[PDB]
């Protein structure tokens, strides 16, 4: 429920060695420039900015 991808598309790259943060940032770049991170709930989020 914390995941809201603004432009969901298929990945054509195998991200199979990247630091997770770098992969997530690449995903955000491909999508609508989303914010990601870990909440104080210890839950991951990926959602539209602002």
């Amino acid at each position: 429920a914390n995941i809201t991808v603004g432009d969901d598309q298929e990945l054509t790259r195998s991200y199979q060695g990247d630091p997770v943060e770098n992969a997530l940032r690449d995903f955000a770049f491909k999508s609508t420039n989303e914010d990601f991170g870990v909440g104080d709930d210890l839950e991951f989020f990926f959602q539209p900015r602002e």
């Binding site: 603004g6 432009d7 598309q9 298929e10 054509t12 609508t32 420039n33 900015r49 602002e50």
Partner: protein
């Protein structure tokens, strides 16, 4: 600014060209790993089924010392009589694919002594691949053949040896010579009516013999007529093209193609799900709606024999369907969300 100052090129954001071919290297890329033994030609003029039978009439063979035999039920009303020792018939062909050795067959329409009981000479066949000679004796000294189609490669009729099952490379100059190597009981000899060196296509059509892939009709109507016979080309090649890949859902797709003919079993089949193929029959342009939006497009193409004719052997399938300027367009989002209140437009100009 009303317009671009001297526009060079213009493309759609509604349709994206996901696959195309227009040259040899492009066609090789999208056909995938076709083996050298497959009967398909990739050329500057398109992709085309390979000539697979070299059906040659009596009067068209290279003559030496052979008798001019005329009976109405022979093709073109005539055949060549192998009358005597050292008198020969020669045929040249160049295969435009590799013929695997097991698959080579030499069909002759041949009859002894105008249908008489009395033997013709023993026949030796010499096959020459770029100077490499293979010789065998399919017909014995004491045999008569009724007017029928016979394979002189893989069967013997009183003879001592068959074709040695050698592979024939693409672009080899192949000379085939038939020689009566002994004396004749019957003065009119073995009359050969039409010669068909052919690839049996048993890799393509799962039947154990060339009869499964070609016509071998044995009735020209007895009036000096022509014969349907072994057609020059394979019946139907179904070509699976490499998957046209997308990052986004394809809802519908459109194709464009240039062809010499589109009759018979010509079709283009398109799928979204990799299995439910939607067929467009007998057209160079076509549009397909997929049941649900999905990612990657798969294409199947059917190329066939064509033409009917009454002035030469063979009468059927003397032409093959050639296709060139393949284009596959899909309904894909080219205008895309990018940020809050930002769109990105990604048009493509093909090379």
């Amino acid at each position: 600014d009303t317009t671009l100052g001297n526009e060079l090129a213009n493309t759609s954001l509604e349709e994206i060209l996901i696959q195309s071919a227009s040259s040899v290297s492009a066609w090789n890329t999208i056909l995938g790993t076709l083996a050298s033994t497959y009967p398909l030609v990739v050329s500057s003029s398109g992709i085309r089924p390979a000539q697979t039978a070299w059906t040659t009439e009596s009067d068209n063979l290279a003559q030496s010392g052979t008798a001019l035999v005329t009976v109405g039920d022979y093709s073109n009303g005539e055949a060549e009589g192998l009358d005597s020792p050292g008198d020969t018939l020669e045929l040249s062909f160049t295969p435009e694919h590799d013929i695997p050795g097991e698959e080579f067959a030499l069909w002759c329409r041949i009859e002894t002594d105008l249908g008489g009981t009395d033997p013709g000479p023993e026949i030796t066949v010499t096959l020459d691949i770029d100077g490499d000679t293979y010789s065998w004796v399919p017909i014995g000294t004491n045999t008569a053949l009724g007017l029928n189609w016979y394979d002189l490669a893989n069967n013997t009729f009183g003879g001592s040896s068959t074709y040695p099952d050698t592979d024939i490379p693409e672009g080899s100059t192949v000379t085939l010579s038939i020689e009566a190597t002994s004396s004749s009981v019957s003065g009119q000899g073995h009359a050969v009516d039409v010669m068909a060196p052919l690839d049996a296509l048993t890799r393509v059509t799962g039947g154990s013999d060339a009869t499964s892939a070609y016509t071998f009709d044995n009735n020209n109507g007895g009036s000096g007529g022509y014969l349907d016979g072994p057609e020059l080309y394979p019946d139907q090649l179904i070509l699976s093209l490499e998957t046209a890949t997308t990052r986004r859902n394809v809802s519908e797709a459109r194709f464009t193609l240039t062809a010499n003919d589109t009759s018979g079993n010509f079709y283009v089949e398109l799928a979204n799900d990799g299995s439910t193929f939607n067929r467009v029959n007998n057209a160079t342009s076509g549009s397909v709606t997929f049941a649900s939006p999905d990612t990657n497009v798969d294409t199947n193409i059917s190329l066939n024999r064509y033409g009917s004719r009454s002035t030469a052997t063979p009468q059927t399938g003397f032409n093959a369907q050639e296709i060139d300027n393949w284009e596959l367009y899909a309904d894909i989002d080219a205008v895309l969300p990018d940020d809050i209140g930002v769109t990105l437009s990604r048009a493509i100009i093909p090379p």
